Amino acid sequence: ELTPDQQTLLHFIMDSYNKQRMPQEITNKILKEEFSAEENFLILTEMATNHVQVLVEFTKKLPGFQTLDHEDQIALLKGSAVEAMFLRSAEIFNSDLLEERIRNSGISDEYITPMFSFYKSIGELKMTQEEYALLTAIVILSPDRQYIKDREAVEKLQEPLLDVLQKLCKIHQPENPQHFAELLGRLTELRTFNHHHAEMLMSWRVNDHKTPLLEEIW
Amino acid sequence: ELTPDQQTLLHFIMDSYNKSAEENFLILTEMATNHVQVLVEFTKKLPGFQTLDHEDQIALLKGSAVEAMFLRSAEIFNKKLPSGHSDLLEERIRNSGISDEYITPMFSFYKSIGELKMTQEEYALLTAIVILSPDRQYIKDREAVEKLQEPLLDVLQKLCKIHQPENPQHFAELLGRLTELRTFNHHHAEMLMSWRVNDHKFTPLLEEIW
Numbered sequence: 001e002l003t004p005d006q007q008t009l010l011h012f013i014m015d016s017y018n019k020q021r022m023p024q025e026i027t028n029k030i031l032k033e034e035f036s037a038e039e040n041f042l043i044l045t046e047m048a049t050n051h052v053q054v055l056v057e058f059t060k061k062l063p064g065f066q067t068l069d070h071e072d073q074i075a076l077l078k079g080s081a082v083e084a085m086f087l088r089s090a091e092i093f094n095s096d097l098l099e100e101r102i103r104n105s106g107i108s109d110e111y112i113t114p115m116f117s118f119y120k121s122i123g124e125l126k127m128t129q130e131e132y133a134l135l136t137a138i139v140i141l142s143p144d145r146q147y148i149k150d151r152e153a154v155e156k157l158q159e160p161l162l163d164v165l166q167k168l169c170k171i172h173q174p175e176n177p178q179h180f181a182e183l184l185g186r187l188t189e190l191r192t193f194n195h196h197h198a199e200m201l202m203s204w205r206v207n208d209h210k211t212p213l214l215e216e217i218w
Numbered sequence: 219e220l221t222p223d224q225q226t227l228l229h230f231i232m233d234s235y236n237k238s239a240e241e242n243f244l245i246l247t248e249m250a251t252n253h254v255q256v257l258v259e260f261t262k263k264l265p266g267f268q269t270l271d272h273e274d275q276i277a278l279l280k281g282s283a284v285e286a287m288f289l290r291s292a293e294i295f296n297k298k299l300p301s302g303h304s305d306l307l308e309e310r311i312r313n314s315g316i317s318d319e320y321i322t323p324m325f326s327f328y329k330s331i332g333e334l335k336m337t338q339e340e341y342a343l344l345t346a347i348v349i350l351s352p353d354r355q356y357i358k359d360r361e362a363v364e365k366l367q368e369p370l371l372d373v374l375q376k377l378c379k380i381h382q383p384e385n386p387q388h389f390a391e392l393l394g395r396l397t398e399l400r401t402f403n404h405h406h407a408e409m410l411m412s413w414r415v416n417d418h419k420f421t422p423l424l425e426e427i428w
């Protein structure tokens with residue numbers, strides 16, 4: 001069912017979605033480091049710091065994103081970043097040590113409980129990598145973010161991706177005509193989450209340089 | 219009373235020296251992040267430091283960093299910034315999730331060294347003297363380090379006689395504060411020393427440089 005052009009759109013979304021790569025140093029810390037509230041927080045925030053970078057990269061490569069007005073590009077990424085990070089974080093769980101660090105990191109259950117139920121609801125959907133990648137592009141190119149001067153130009157970028165995802169939900173899950181709707185339902189659900197804690201964190205950058213002090217590069 | 223050569227040393231050292239709970243924790247670790255960088259640049263400028271063998275340079279800075287950081291935190295804390303009378307930094311510390319285990323001795327040390335009415339020159343010389351401690355683990359040439367440390371102790375002991383001649387205890391009190399820092403538990407600070415925290419809140423996310 002995909003067209004050649006639909007195949008190519010999908011191809012370039014997958015290459016840029018892959019190429020995401022979490023340094024082994026970060027993933028090794030999860031098992032090996034001390035478990036204490038401060039170390040746990042610094043490890044989760046270092047991972048999230050890697051995710052923001054990957055997210056911003058992925059956004060800049062999205063098909064047509066660079067064609068948009070520069071002030072609207074800023075506003076689109078500002079509006080979408082929290083929900084896109086939430087979606088990313090789910091992929092990381094779907095790790096038993098990672099959860100125990102999250103549950104003793106000083107972060108309030110106010111924010112941990114909704115996220116963990118969200119992860120379960122995502123695992124139930126049996127999402128392919130192709131489906132994560134498309135849904136991430138879709139949440140990012142949302143034409144209704146605040147502060148967008150030209151909503152129709154963002155609609156033009158989003159709509160081809162919505163078409164491709166819908167065709168993929170038909171092919172891969174013919175017995176479930178409600179698969180596509182249920183994917184979009186997860187994005188609807190993220191918009192209802194409390195974004196305030198994530199917005200407070202979104203500008204912070206945490207990196208472990210545990211290289212001799214004397215040889216460190218600033 | 220300082221010799222011309224001692225004045226040359228002092229002015230050089232001074233020129234080199236003059237270069238929610240989660241949210242409070244990030245702010246404090248960002249400040250400390252800046253302090254490590256300053257401390258490392260100051261160390262590289264110490265007279266003679268670059269002439270030491272490379273492994274002894276690494277050993278000195280590694281073995282002395284915690285103490286030098288604690289001394290820098292005392293200098294900042296007692297300045298009560300930005301006003302000279304603000305309790306903001308103390309309030310952030312008390313609500314940052316850091317345990318009383320680590321806060322209590324730091325506060326006790328800030329009060330103790332605060333009563334000595336430290337000058338910047340005293341801080342700069344005491345930092346240099348901490349870093350050039352010849353007795354650290356893993357130093358091969360202890361005698362060369364001791365030779366670098368000695369003229370700084372000499373300048374500092376003179377500065378104490380010049381500026382506090384009625385308080386002959388003053389140099390001894392400075393050395394006793396260094397023994398306190400050496401004896402404090404370093405485990406928490408060693409855990410934090412390699413972490414680097416910065417708030418990139420001045421650009422939109424799209425324009426941030428990675």
Ligand SMILES: CN(C)c1cc(Cl)c(C(=O)N(Cc2ccccc2)c2ccc(O)c(C(C)(C)C)c2)c(Cl)c1
Pocket residue numbers: 044045046047048049051052082085086088089092102107111112115116197198199201202203204205206
């Ligand atoms: C840029 N920084 C330092 C951020 C830190 C966090 Cl915790 C978050 C954040 O709120 N979360 C959501 C979350 C998930 C699980 C429990 C509490 C909060 C976030 C976003 C991406 C992530 O990879 C993670 C981790 C915990 C899975 C690393 C967390 C974000 Cl958005 C940014």
Ligand SMILES: CN(C)c1cc(Cl)c(C(=O)N(Cc2ccccc2)c2ccc(O)c(C(C)(C)C)c2)c(Cl)c1
Pocket residue numbers: 246247248249250251253254284287288290291294295311316320321324406407408410411412413414415
């Ligand atoms: C490189 N990083 C992120 C460090 C963080 C801290 Cl809290 C510390 C640290 O242990 N202290 C000591 C301390 C002071 C007050 C309460 C608890 C612990 C440290 C070192 C330099 C500092 O500037 C600070 C602050 C609290 C004054 C920012 C703290 C160190 Cl050494 C390094």
